[PDB]
Ligand binder design. Structure first.
Ligand SMILES: Cc1cn([C@H]2C[C@H](O)[C@@H](COP(=O)(O)OP(=O)(O)OP(=O)(O)O)O2)c(=O)[nH]c1=O
Ligand SMILES: [Mg+2]
Lengths: 702, 106
DNA sequence: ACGGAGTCGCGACTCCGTTATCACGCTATGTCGTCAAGTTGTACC
DNA sequence: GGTACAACTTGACGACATAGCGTGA
């Protein structure tokens, strides 16, 4: 077993030089210092460690270090350097797996961290947490440039190898070693009876918990998805941007000819009091009072000193001791809720629902609810809502900071990172290109936004053909998970009933709801315990109707209350009552999942969510890992030059860009067989079903 | 009355070519230093009656004139020598300060 | 733990309740640090 | 009379922290 770390000149898109690599070994207990010319010896040491059956440990090695070494080995020596999967261990994945809750424990320690590392899984953050940090290379280089005198550039420190970078790499290696020993000090996720630093790779992957293997296979597959990427349609996005900009100018002209301008009291600094006594009054907006001013200036001449010649007049137009109201000529901005609320007060409408800071609720429900006497403004409310929607679409598409047109690289492929663990419940999150924010198939222009996303925009590298995209989704995931949990209460009757037709369609017929996704939203809100006002807001009716539907479904399915009572008596000790808070004692801060993780719980009425979301996330994660493993072992090839590629793993649904429709059908059948394998492996008491679609883009695949 | 309340059209037709010293107040409903300075202006309208023109203008009910003259702060009293702007001061003055400001311009 | 409300024999006595949930993004707006430049009291030859 | 000077003040500008609200599963 060795622990290594590298140092490149740039990120994955611009890496072209290997600076230094430091190796520590347990069999020698010595530091192995290298040079920029020792790149071949570094690769030979790694290949010897793989051939000896050892384990090489990096920090975030799956996303950066392994493909960086592969690209450097290719572009320098033209030698195929491809390390195996099981001989690589990440410390970031183990840290995210063991310490899955940093926000509820980082406070009380901030006395250590500088402040910017609050809830950070970086390598320097653990260097401050383990009290082993001797400076920073970036701060040292900034001090160096300020010592010489020339200006600072953020990229110059990754251009030249030096002893400071060498010692920084040594510090990174020893922080990685201390962090690895701290994570191997665990007892639940790792049995301490076997010294894991002196075992084989098969012994290490077999004598630990299943969750570590699941997490590392998921990290390897997500790194493969990152180096794959997702296509894009630049001309269609630019045509949509021009169309939305023209319609935005059209609606801005309509709203500026509908409404008018006014004055805003923004600008006051000092304090106003009662002119009779001196008591402050909160019934006035903020004003300002100057401190220097008058009428006549200082006497400079002799007759000015004698009062004969009048002095110079007050040019600055302010007098010391005259309070005024500093205002500005605000123009009506329809992207300002405050301006919309001001105009609705001036139209004669009385707001009802308020927030915690006095300003009333301004959303689509109350904009449908406003009924005034003016038909022109009553029609212009719809133009306000359409302007807000188009402003949201443009801010998502191009004018935002995290813009698609700003993040698409030169290959036309979107490269957006994905955090594997992410949230505390185990469900994965998405980085700065957020693929979850892409609208659905019924929002206005979201059909065109999904039609601009497809696998047909990448031609073949040899034949030059548009590919075929395959999308596979699961239906009733959490509901069949709930059936699996409460089968031991209701003798499997709900699990037998859920396989008879679509459960969401049957609930839609039973509740008389307009759309299937509205039925999904309602049954999820009833599952996770919504209030009566929230149920009435979803169903579009009153809280009496909400209580009627809640009592009807609760008397239809009585096992849910028994399951909630079982959990409440399971992990919760007691519960006190504050007028504004709720003191609840647990003495059990976590719930064991399907694999055996310590999934942290936040709330006693969210422990059910903590159970079910973790169950669905683990099912989907091991499902896609098994699907990838089966598609490898059946004889296909993963990648752009091969046959298929993974490009979308947002939530409970994959998109696979195959080569032909027969290959896509093989992928769908393989995903179905992998889903049945998971349902047989984890002792699933019901049947799991998938649904695969075959279209050129997301307009057909979903 | 004592202080003539004007509109935008009355301002444009009876201020710019009125041939006299015209003092126009700019006031809003929700403030408030104008409520302080308004009895002072009512006293000056009787003290200096027969030598200048004292008027008031609402910046809320007349949205034309105040964006044309570009007012950043209210109250603000503008002295009009033959209609055009000659001298002005921003704030809520007192009676003696306002009398000194009028004596410093005549 | 006091508001909402079921109830004792319509006012008050007394019993129940109390969250939809994890992610990210964003334009608006108030706070506060930083700075360019006069200025106005001011101390002394 | 004169002359430097030094904190005060006014105005502008930029980084930063919420605020509901909007997307998805
Ligand atoms: C849509 C939605 C999902 N979820 C959670 C629970 C769901 O089981 C999970 C994914 O939801 P879905 O995948 O939309 O539910 P589904 O699998 O039954 O239907 P479909 O085949 O059309 O995809 O995310 C919510 O908590 N609130 C929501 O509004
Ligand atoms: Mg689904």
């Amino acid at each position: 077993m060795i622990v290594s770390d590298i140092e490149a000149n740039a990120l994955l898109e611009s890496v072209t030089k290997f600076h230094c690599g430091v190796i520590y070994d347990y069999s020698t207990a010595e530091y192995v210092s290298y040079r920029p010319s020792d790149f071949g010896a570094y690769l030979d040491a790694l290949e010897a460690e793989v051939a000896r059956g050892g384990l090489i440990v990096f920090h975030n090695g799956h996303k950066y270090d392994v493909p960086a070494l592969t690209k450097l080995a290719k572009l320098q020596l033209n030698r195929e350097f491809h390390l195996p999967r099981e001989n690589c261990i990440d410390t970031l994945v183990l840290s995210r797996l063991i310490h899955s809750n940093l926000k509820d424990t980082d406070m009380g320690l901030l006395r250590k961290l500088p402040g910017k590392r609050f809830g950070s899984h970086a390598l320097e953050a653990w260097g401050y947490r383990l009290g082993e940090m001797k400076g920073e290379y970036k701060d040292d280089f900034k001090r160096m440039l300020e010592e010489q005198g020339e200006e600072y550039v953020d990229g110059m420190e990754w251009w030249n190898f030096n002893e400071e970078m060498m010692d920084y790499n040594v510090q990174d290696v020893v922080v990685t070693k201390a962090l690895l020993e701290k994570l191997l000090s665990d007892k639940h996720y790792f049995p301490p009876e076997i010294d894991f630093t002196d075992v084989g790779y098969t012994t290490f992957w077999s004598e630990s918990l299943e969750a570590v293997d699941i997490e590392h296979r998921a990290a390897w597959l997500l790194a493969k998805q990152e180096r794959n990427g997702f296509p894009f349609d630049t001309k269609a996005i630019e045509e949509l941007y021009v169309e939305l900009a023209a319609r935005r100018s059209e609606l801005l002209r309509k709203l500026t000819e509908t409404f008018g301008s006014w004055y805003q009291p923004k600008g006051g600094t000092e304090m106003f009091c009662h002119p009779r006594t001196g008591k402050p009054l909160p019934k006035y907006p903020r004003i300002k009072t100057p401190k220097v001013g008058g009428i006549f200036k200082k006497p400079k001449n002799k007759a000015q000193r004698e009062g004969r010649e009048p002095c110079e007049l007050d040019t600055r137009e302010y007098v010391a001791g005259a309070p005024y109201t500093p205002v500005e000529h605000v123009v009506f901005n329809p992207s300002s809720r405050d301006h919309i609320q001001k105009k609705l007060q001036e139209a004669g409408w009385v707001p009802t629902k308020y927030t915690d800071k006095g300003a009333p609720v301004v959303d689509d429900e109350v904009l449908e609810g406003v009924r005034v006497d003016d038909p022109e403004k009553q029609a212009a409310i719809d133009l306000i809502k359409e302007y807000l929607m188009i402003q949201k679409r443009i801010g998502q598409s191009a004018e935002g900071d995290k813009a698609w047109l700003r993040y698409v690289a030169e290959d036309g492929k979107i490269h957006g990172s994905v955090n594997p663990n992410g949230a505390v419940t185990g469900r994965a999150t998405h980085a700065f290109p957020n693929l979850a924010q892409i609208p659905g198939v019924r929002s206005p222009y979201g059909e065109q936004c999904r039609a601009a996303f497809g696998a047909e925009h990448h031609l073949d590298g040899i034949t030059g053909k548009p590919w075929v995209q395959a999308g596979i989704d699961a239906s009733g995931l959490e509901l069949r998970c709930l059936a699996h949990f409460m089968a031991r209460f209701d003798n499997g009757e709900y699990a037998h009933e859920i396989l008879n037709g679509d459960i969401h369609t049957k609930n839609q017929i039973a509740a008389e709801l307009p759309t299937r996704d509205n039925a999904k939203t309602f049954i999820y809100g009833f599952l996770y315990g919504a209030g009566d006002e929230k149920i009435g807001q979803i169903v579009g009716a009153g809280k009496e109707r909400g209580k009627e539907l809640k009592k009807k479904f609760l008397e239809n399915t009585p096992a849910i209350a028994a399951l909630r009572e079982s959990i409440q008596q399971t992990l919760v000790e007691s519960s006190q009552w504050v007028a504004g808070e709720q003191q609840v004692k647990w003495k059990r801060r976590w719930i064991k999942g399907l694999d055996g993780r310590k999934v942290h719980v936040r709330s006693p009425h969210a422990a059910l969510n903590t159970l079910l979301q973790s169950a669905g996330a683990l099912i989907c994660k091991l499902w896609i890992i098994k699907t990838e493993e089966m598609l490898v072992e059946k004889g296909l090839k993963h990648g752009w030059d091969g046959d298929f590629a993974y490009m979308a793993w947002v939530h409970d649904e994959i998109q696979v860009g195959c080569r032909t429709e027969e290959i896509a059908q093989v992928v769908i059948e393989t995903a179905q067989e992998a889903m049945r394998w998971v349902g047989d492996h984890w002792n699933f008491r019901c049947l799991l079903d998938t649904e695969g679609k075959m279209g050129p883009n997301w307009a057909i695949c979903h | 009355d004592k202080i003539i309340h004007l509109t935008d059209d009355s301002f444009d037709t009876d201020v710019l070519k009125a041939d006299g010293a015209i003092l126009v107040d700019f006031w809003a409903e929700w403030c408030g230093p104008c409520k302080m300075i308004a009895p002072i202006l009512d006293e000056i309208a009787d003290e200096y009656q027969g030598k200048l023109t004292v008027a008031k203008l609402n910046i809320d009910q007349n949205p034309g004139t105040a964006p044309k003259y570009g007012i950043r702060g209210i109250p603000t009293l503008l002295l009009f020598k033959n209609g055009e702007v000659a001298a002005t001061k921003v704030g809520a003055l007192s009676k003696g300060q306002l009398k000194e400001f009028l004596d410093a311009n005549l």
